[PDB]
Amino acid sequence: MLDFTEASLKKVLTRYNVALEKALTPEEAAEELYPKDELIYPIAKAIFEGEEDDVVEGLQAAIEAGKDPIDLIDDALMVGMGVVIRLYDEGVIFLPNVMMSADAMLEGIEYCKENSGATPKTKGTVVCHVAEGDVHDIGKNIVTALLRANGYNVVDLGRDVPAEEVLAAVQKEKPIMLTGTALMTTTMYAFKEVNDMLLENGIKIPFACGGGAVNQDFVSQFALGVYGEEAADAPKIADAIIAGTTDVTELREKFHKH
């Protein structure tokens, strides 16, 4: 069978990703960002590693050599997490490294939820759903995971979600933002029902729309619609609601333009 010379291969294709990789190893990169607080340290490192036992182990020792029962969420878990998110945006780590990390954090939160009664504080609630008729989970889950990992409470409405159910949950939870995901042409138009039925009940919040079957021009025919292509765009738009912008037209201006 045929093979290339080195010079031939180099002429025929290029793995563009190889030359853009940064020198530092994920571990070294993480080490440049960890707090050197001795107590918070082995927790942040434990999150980065997706090692849940060490998160607990590291949380037990920090409430014994100090206090901060509910605070350790923000002081230790959300700092460890801010490291993971950073490295993900810089592309030194990948999605599954973030997922493993969010799993290890969530178990570290609910362990705080057992030494408290105090009820934790979030940047606000976001409701997520997949348009009805659509089983495509993944993109939503990555929107779910990123949101939580950025410090948001997430009521995830699941898969084949039928509008009436969405309406009812924006009520129960009064969220800062609703998200939607569609992947089939046979399905994107469940964003209709929802946009119309939020209007037909007097609700005015950002409706972050995404999904393979979905583009910037499709979501614009909806007053509430805001397009995000990357899942990393969901918390970035949620932060613009912490900034004060509820007006969709003003959001579109600082987020559209593809």
Partner: protein, 459 residues
């Protein structure tokens, strides 16, 4: 049921496109694997056409008419039409049936006028699921089988499905670099489910005088591939996507162990491994399926294909005519190049050229190159009776293959190299004993994945 423990071919070098060891006769005078590659055109109806049965039948009559018209206008000798059911065609057996009947009628007309060789594939939706979970052995099962037999009774020549076994545990694992979870979901749960359904589908195929064609790990292996995306994505290490592909091969292999005879489903990229084992024909997809998705093995997949597919494209207008005409013409010409190579005994160089085009593009292509695929095949059949160990063999063999490549001209990133080393270590730490592994995972995933129902797999 009847497991492979040796290879159909003595060596990788005996494999080529358009010929396979056991050809399939089907449809209107068509032969598959019989010394000519065949274009296989796919298509999705527009959203509106789904509103009623009559709208759907009509859309597919436009598709079929447009395709056969194009074939005879450009002089192509042969064509396969693949209808991937929308859910409503399977949930209502008689709907898929009536589409099959309407398509076959237009095809019979063109076959009588022109003598153009053709066959129809219907790919039933795996409807064994509700809003909350997989229901692989529940109420929908009998409807599932009725969809097959109805379509087979009314014109479909080849019967396929992209089944969902182990999909739920796959979805959780793939997001988490959980390699053993990949092994369990794809290699074990998948294998078990495949044996149940393919046993029934083959019985149906036999009863109705039609062909039990094959399945695809699209629900698991292709998902890993798409999450992995292009060279610059950061959502799944390509060195892990390729391991999913390796494991998908003994899973997809089960269809054929259980009575399927090919051609396998286009989106079964693992089919090259399966062909090297079974000697049966397989459909492939690559550079001429970009209408459906990007991939990193556009030419290589042609290397030993028997049928050549565009995967899917919505039915709508382009300047050059209908969408299904534009792509079927390109598939047909790709097949003409290959057939010219066969007729002039230059197939082997062309096969090599196709393989070499992509060998070094990505670890996902590297492993699928026909020599490396045959190697994977060898690693499965040496423990062929053991659905777990053959799959584990494949996964590690994959890792060895990629390592060797990386020690030569395969240019992996540091990140890719590390993910690969982590996974090889995860795989080498596993027990050799199947029961041991099955039992640990059953209790692990029962716990970690709440939508995982062991009854789906007879547990």
């Amino acid at each position: 049921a009847k497991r492979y423990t040796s290879m159909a071919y003595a060596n990788a070098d005996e494999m080529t496109f358009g010929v396979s060891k056991y050809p399939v006769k089907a449809g209107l005078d068509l032969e598959i694997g019989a010394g000519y590659t065949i274009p296989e055109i796919n298509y999705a109806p527009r959203p509106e056409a789904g509103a009623s049965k009559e709208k759907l039948i009509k859309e597919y009559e436009r598709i079929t008419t447009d395709v056969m018209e194009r074939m005879v206008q450009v002089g192509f000798p042969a064509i396969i039409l693949e209808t991937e059911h929308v859910q409503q065609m399977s949930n209502n057996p008689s709907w898929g049936a009536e589409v099959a009947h309407a398509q076959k009628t237009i095809m019979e007309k063109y076959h009588d006028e022109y003598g153009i060789k053709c066959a129809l594939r219907h790919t039933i939706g795996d409807i064994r699921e509700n809003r909350e979970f997989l229901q692989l052995r529940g109420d929908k099962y009998s409807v599932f089988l009725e969809a097959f037999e109805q379509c087979a009774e009314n014109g479909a020549d080849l019967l396929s499905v992209e089944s969902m076994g182990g999909k739920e545990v796959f979805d959780y694992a793939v997001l988490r670099n959980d390699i053993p979870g990949l092994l369990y979901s794809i290699g074990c749960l998948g294998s078990i489910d495949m044996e149940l359904i393919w046993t029934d589908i083959s019985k149906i195929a036999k009863k109705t005088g039609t062909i039990s064609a094959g399945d695809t790990d699209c629900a698991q292996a292709n998902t890993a591939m798409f999450i992995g995306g292009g060279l610059l994505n950061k959502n799944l290490a390509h060195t892990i996507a390729v391991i999913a592909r390796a494991i998908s091969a003994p899973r997809s292999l089960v269809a054929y162990e259980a009575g399927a005879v090919g051609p396998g489903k286009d989106c079964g990229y693992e089919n090259i491994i399966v062909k090297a084992i079974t000697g049966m024909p397989m459909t492939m997809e690559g550079k001429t399926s970009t209408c459906a998705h990007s991939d990193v093995m556009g030419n290589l997949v042609m290397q030993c294909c028997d049928c050549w597919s565009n995967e899917s494209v919505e039915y709508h207008g382009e300047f050059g005519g209908t969408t299904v005409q534009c792509w079927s013409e390109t598939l047909a010409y790709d097949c003409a190049l290959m057939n010219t190579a066969l007729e002039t005994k230059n197939d082997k160089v062309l096969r090599d050229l196709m393989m070499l085009s992509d060998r070094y593009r990505d670890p996902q292509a590297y492993m699928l190159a026909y020599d490396n695929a045959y190697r994977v095949g060898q690693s499965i059949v040496k423990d062929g009776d053991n659905i777990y160990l053959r799959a584990k063999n494949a996964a590690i063999e994959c890792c060895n293959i990629i390592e060797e490549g990386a020690a030569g001209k395969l240019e992996l990133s540091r990140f890719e190299t590390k993910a690969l080393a982590d996974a090889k270590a995860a795989l080498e730490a596993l027990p050799d004993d199947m029961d041991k592994f099955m039992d640990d995972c059953l209790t692990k995933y029962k716990s970690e994945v709440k939508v995982f129902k062991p009854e789906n797999y007879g547990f």
